[PDB]
Structures are given as structure tokens and as C-alpha cells.
Amino acid sequence: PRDCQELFQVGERQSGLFEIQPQGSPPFLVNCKMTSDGGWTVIQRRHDGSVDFNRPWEAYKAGFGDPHGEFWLGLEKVHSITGDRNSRLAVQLRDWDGNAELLQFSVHLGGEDTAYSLQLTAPVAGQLGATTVPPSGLSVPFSTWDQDHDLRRDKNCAKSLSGGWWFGTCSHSNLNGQYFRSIPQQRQKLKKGIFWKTWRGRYYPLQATTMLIQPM
Ligand SMILES: CCCCCCCCCCCCCC(=O)O
């Protein structure tokens, strides 16, 4: 089977670890979530800060962490699942009072030759906050501290924050930032945290995050 939706389609009901083999790829183990809307591949999960997410490009390309805990599936693995297909990207956030916010966007995801860019239509970039975006849409490369795509020549967004992310701006989101349990006092600290600006604010550190994907 090529992904979690294909496992769902042949009748798999249980969420957990499963072997898939996307086309052109060796087999590997993924976290599948089986829902009423088919199978979803978990590509990122964070809940307790046990796993260090401040990692360079090759770790973000290959994947890291604990498949039974916090992890990053890995951009190369994620792109072998999406191919060049339109995909649903689910983003689930938890704040410190147990409130959850469930978001979903249609995206395309490019290969490494695009630096694993997120490709958004103008309406979807509108959903995320972009106000002026041509009909050709928006393309946001992935960045890590050793491979940052900020065009400002003296500005490295990933190195200034933490982790790897599609830093369209350096102020929209970062679910791969540093895990914080409470109020940090050090100048320029909560800026490095796990945040999604339009939900709880630029400086609110989220308690838990899950990102999932489903091609088509
Ligand atoms: C689903 C992950 C989204 C990754 C970030 C791409 C968002 C494109 C930029 C959105 C507009 C930025 C506006 C802002 O900084 O508040």
C-alpha cells in the first residue's frame, strides 16, 4: 500500500504504525490515523517536549524523533506520499487549557529541488492570512538554520527562531519551535517557541500540535 488512505481503502480501521511503500520509494513505517474521512498520515506530533526539534536540514529531510511519541516524519518521506498531488493538510493545536483548534488547508508540496516548498493557491493563502496574492498563488520554501531562505542577506529566520519550518514570514507560525512549559523571562525567548499567531498569538507557546496529510 502506498499510504494511509490506501490502507483505509482496503479496510484497515486502527490508528497506529503501519508499513507503506509509496511509488519510487523503499518501504517505511508511518503513523496512520483512520477517521470517518479516510486515512491520514501523521507527519508531525508534539505534546511534552521530550524530543529536540532544533535540527539541521538533513534531519528535517529524513525525519527524527520517537514514532511512539513526539516526531517529525521527514520531508522526503512526506513528499513521496504526496507526489505532486493536491493534498489536505490538517493542523491541530492544543492550548494549555485543553482547547483544541482543528484547521485544514488544501496544499501542494514540492520536492527537494524546491526545498520542499508549500505551494498554495491564492484562496488558501488567503485563509492563512495573505491579503494580496496573485492567482498564480504562493510558494514557501522550508528552512532550517543551516539552510535558510530568507532573502535578506543579514537575516536568518530559522537560526533566529528554532527548528525547521515554512517561514513564509518569520511571524506567522512555527509548530517546530522550542517546547516551553511556562513563562520564559530571557529577552527573545518565547519568539523561539511553538506558535500559530492567528489562534493564540505570536508569543503563546502551544501545549500540543499534530499535522496530518491526505493526498487528493
Ligand atoms: C500550514 C503551514 C503554513 C506555513 C506558513 C505559510 C503561510 C504563508 C504566509 C501567511 C501570511 C503571513 C501573515 C502573517 O505573518 O501573519
Curated annotation (Swiss-Prot):
Residues of the full protein shown: 185 to 400 of 406
Resulting phenotype, R152C: No effect on protein folding
Reported impact of G177S: Impaired protein folding
Disulphide bridges: C4-C32, C157-C170
Domain of life: Eukaryota
Protein name: ANGPTL4 C-terminal chain
Effect of R200W: Impaired protein folding
Domain Fibrinogen C-terminal residues, every copy: 1-216
